[PDB]
């Protein structure tokens, strides 16, 4: 198999040991690197490979990123980059990608891919215990917009369909490689866009249960996720109008009890969030918020002056969501804004009033919450 | 819809209260009540239907349970009665099933399954929180045999299958009424024969999932479900060289945290299940087990003289499994009580290395079990 | 014994029903409710009084509170006209308090606290399961001062010392109506001083654990508990001077597990909290905070603009504390105001570092944040 | 200070790491090892010890045990040696003792102690969490009778009295050396004499918690711990004439979550145990029943032909309890097998009506043991 290791700015040591590991095991004939540019990580890891691949017996190269889609030059083309590595320049019949700052990889998380991939799944996602106010992209933007758009199909149901450790086959990796709408995603909204056509397509998908291992987001804001949370709904909206069949088949491995460090994470400042909201408004963005409902445009309207959230409940964001599928334009600076600012109260008002009441209560509210907005969006 | 209680002697109020509850639903046109005998009960609700059905509107009616199968008159016999009422009798689009005993029963049991049925699932599955060391029928023979025998299928993935609360189209009892497998099926393997004939089939199948739980059998040992574990197990048995296809459709609400009463319930008497263990041997049980594992054989043969169940591990238990598939014979008294012990001695280790371990090690220990032994029969 | 119902706005159905409870219990000879007002809760209880007194064989008084104090006409006065009720109109050797509002009170409460106190315990305070955001007067005002100012001995080792549910033999009564300090004391730091003066007395202490809980107050800001913190805090500064010697007899029940409805609780609209926090600023307000250390005088200015409480930190607020206890100045209404936005930051702040890891999290945090505080009182 | 690591057959590997933390520590100016006698452990910790001295500049001896008390040669010499030693040898203020086969020690433990001590503590008990099937002699024998026979007092509310991890002051270690009933308990006894004499005396006692760091024993039965068992109950009875005030100064650090590798341990084996339940009867042991009551006389004859403990509830096994303070006689083999045997039982009572419910309701439920037995005994 091939194991790939798209990387950008991450420490190159844990890199480095991440890639001995993946050369290490036996299933693996060749780990791949695909860096940004020729930064400080990228010569580390080049001087590295060459010992790597003579220790082990297994071939590790380095190569940059190409340009293969019309976005922001990211994530995406990293990961098409391996794709095309992979279809036009091996005979591997397999693919592995795992982030290059994983801090708990073993052999394991690679023998238990290689091993639901032998039952014969075409795609095996791994997928990890969060904190209560990690994940905010996955729940409120991703999970919910899968919910809310297609609420008989086995979309919403993938547990992290933002997560970059998972399995394809060839033939799985050909087909999104074919395909346009993926190899255009050069940005963060590729995972949306490998989790939404593996679904459309009907790939088998097994979800692997790691208890540990994803790095943790420096302390910051919610400012810090922006660039990932306008283009994580933009690629939700470029697909608002596809079709997707019922027939699916999914199954997760059953977690274990969540590790103390987890439950007790706070994902998030909440005073540098709730400082921000009251910042960089326009007199466009206060104009805009009349498309929405009435207790949204006065509740945000309201942040000028102070930090309001009480408003945006569960049936204001679903409400919210769809006013933005319809109006909101992607590079829009306003637009951008206002998507933010509305994710920060949504996020904000979860945060008091699930996230306070401990993990048990929101690991169970944030199903129950994909439930309804299911039921909802299928009464409609 | 037609609501069907199958009920016995038990609790006469409980019964008429559950009657009351269906028969004021306004999604419910007709109840019926099956008992074997024109006992107490049963003349207490051929007594109570009158003012009933004048209340509501709705008709309720009481009927005796046609002898219609081949094996012990039980509760195959009574459900495929109704199933008869429910075809020859009336019109109506849908029918439930629930048991009568159940003390939680309420309107939004019979609502969730319609609005369900709404979307054109042909089966409603209703599913519950139960205790780790409840269903144990359930999971070390019923689906545990789904595993071994049909991997690649849905068959083990649904999560209740000996489960008497459920809803089915016209069309889906119309098919199970004239299949020869199920109307035959007359004693406690109606429910397993029900749930493989549906998934055989192609039927689509929601499982919709009732958080506050059922009814709890009196305390007592292992040997209060003897006959309904040597039925269900006969019913695996009866069905293991069909074939069935891949899924097909198979939607399952997400289940809700588990009660605490439930979570520290123990399901059974130990001391009275470990007595009993050393009970009831004869020359030919002792016998038969040469047709066992080493391991098996010796450690069964033990429980002549004491109690012994650290050999009962989930390997061993596949292997016995294997065994009593091609040996067990229904009806023999010593095939019937080899298989009672055999069962024992794997919920007495199941029970003390994993069970004793909590809640959550239990739930995931369960399904993980099953992904084992399904990775296991697909790879031999 | 005396068991007495001080009483306010609170409907009169929850404090006739706790009477009822009291006057049934065989060790109870007689009941007293302490108004402000005839308003017509009293009167319902004066009402009720004769056919309750004719039913149970025990004699229900209602009574005026008395102007006994010289602080604001609050619980002091209530309680302090109880104790002199009791010593000058009775001849009962104990005499019970409990909140009228109650919602949970039984007759267990009562005996619990009576058969402790025929062991010889001169006080017996019931105590309860809290939320993690409910009593931060109790942890934030009480327990630290107590800490900061006394760390050798046991007054910082008193559960809830701002509890109002309690049972004092004759003599303990007796000594607290006579102390001058205690009479004096008629707003809401009556329960502060009961607590203090008994510990510096020696009267041997139980503590009994209520596993059920008592009464929340309605859903607001924490400037619902303005004044019972500015008054909580007064009572701490005026015995600030204070000599208490070592620890006498003190017994606690251990705490049974905490209710999931309690651990779920959010004590606090933190939206309003936030708000309120940059309201009602005064010029002499922010030259007040010339007075307090760099990052706390900064940090409160801040929030003229905006919400800040990242400073208020555990050291931060132990700083404050010693700042307060010389400069705050009881009934200057920028004190109060000033003590109130300060105190405000530091529950803010516990609430997004401590309480939302969860109510385990929060648990050892506050015990550990009292040793911490009595180790480094006790260093200097 | 002096740190103190009594050693018999532990691995010396894992010894010596320990006694290079404590060597290396700033406040531990010597490290004594003894030794229960000249095996391999005591020559490699022999040949090690220089280059230890000299690589932290702290003084490392090695030494074996003497003959000090009457009992067998165990524990208590150990101790007991190194308290002499520690008198009569050294000026160090303060001792240590740690046991040689800790997994987790560090330099944060001997913190902990001597900054409590620092505080004014006379002992510093550290503390653990146990599995809920490990700490049954702790629970069921210790505890149980200090609360039994000195229901008022401290004994019963110290955590692990047989814990051999503690700090004392010099004037503790002198009144404990020499002290007749402390210096004769020579073997598994001693740490219950510490225990009770210290708590006596009224030594200040503060527990540290630690998260981690026990050992635990080889997987078995309970007949592993039968010498241990034997031992600490006639330790017990030696006491139970003794008259023990209520003043005391005993302060406890609040425990962190439970780890879940301890929460899911499983502490002993139960099927060995069942077992050995049936085995060494003899007629004397059938005979001595008779001093007990009714139901636990019958419960336990019945283990001659097959496991029971239904009979030995919490309320049976107190009943049991004073019998055997009156009756059992060290030494005798009949005496210790029913000890032994009737301890089994209530252990296998605890573990399926309690333990199998789960971590935390096994551990509210032991809390509330106590409470009971102490309301019991303070009754009668």
Same mark, same amino acid.
């Given at each position: ?25 036996? *299933? ?31 071939? #590790? ?10 976005? *922001? ?86 547990? &992290? ?21 993926? *190899? ?31 790095? $943790? ?29 019922? @027939?699916?088949? $999914? ?9 103390? $460090? ?20 326009? @007199? ?10 009435? @207790? #949204? ?32 334009? @992607? ?44 039921? &909802?969006?299928?009464?409609?």
């Amino acid at each position: 198999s091939l194991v790939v290791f798209p990387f950008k700015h991450e420490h190159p040591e844990v890199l480095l040991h991440n890639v001995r590991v993946a050369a290490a095991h036996p *299933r693996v004939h060749e780990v791949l690197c695909i860096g940004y540019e020729r930064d400080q990580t990228y010569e580390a890891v080049e001087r590295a490979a060459p010992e790597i691949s003579r220790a082990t017996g297994t071939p #590790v190269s380095v190569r940059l990123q190409e340009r293969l889609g019309t976005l *922001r030059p990211g994530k995406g083309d990293g990961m098409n980059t391996a794709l095309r590595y992979f279809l036009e320049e091996t005979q591997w019949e397999r693919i592995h990608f795992y982030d290059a700052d994983i801090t708990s990889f073993g052999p394991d998380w690679i023998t238990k891919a290689e091993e639901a991939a032998d039952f014969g799944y075409g795609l095996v996602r791994h997928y990890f215990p969060r904190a209560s106010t990690d994940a905010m992209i996955t729940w409120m933007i991703t999970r919910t917009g899968f919910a809310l758009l297609w609420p008989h199909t086995e979309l919403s149901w993938i547990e &992290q369909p933002l997560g970059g450790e998972l399995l394809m086959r060839r033939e799985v990796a050909a087909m999104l490689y074919e395909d346009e709408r993926v *190899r255009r995603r050069s940005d963060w909204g590729i995972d949306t866009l490998y989790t939404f056509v593996t679904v459309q397509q009907g790939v088998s998908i097994y979800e692997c249960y790691i208890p540990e291992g994803k790095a $943790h987001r420096l302390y910051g804001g919610l400012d810090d996720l922006r660039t990932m949370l306008v283009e994580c709904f933009a690629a939700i909206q470029s697909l608002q109008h596809e079709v997707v069949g019922q @027939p699916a088949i $999914h199954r997760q491995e059953h977690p274990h009890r969540v590790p103390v $460090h987890i439950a007790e994470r706070v994902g998030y400042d909440v005073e540098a969030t709730l400082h921000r909201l009251m910042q960089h408004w326009t @007199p466009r963005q206060v104009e805009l918020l009349e498309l929405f409902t009435t @207790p #949204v445009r006065e509740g945000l309207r309201t942040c000028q002056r102070r930090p309001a959230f009480n408003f945006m409940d569960e049936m204001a964001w679903a409400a919210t969501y769809h006013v933005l599928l319809e109006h909101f334009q @992607p590079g829009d600076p306003d637009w951008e804004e206002l998507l933010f600012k509305l994710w920060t109260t949504r996020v904000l008002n979860y945060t008091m009033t699930v996230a306070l009441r401990g993990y048990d209560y929101a690991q169970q509210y944030l199903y129950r919450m994909l439930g309804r907005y299911r039921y &909802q969006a299928a009464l409609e």
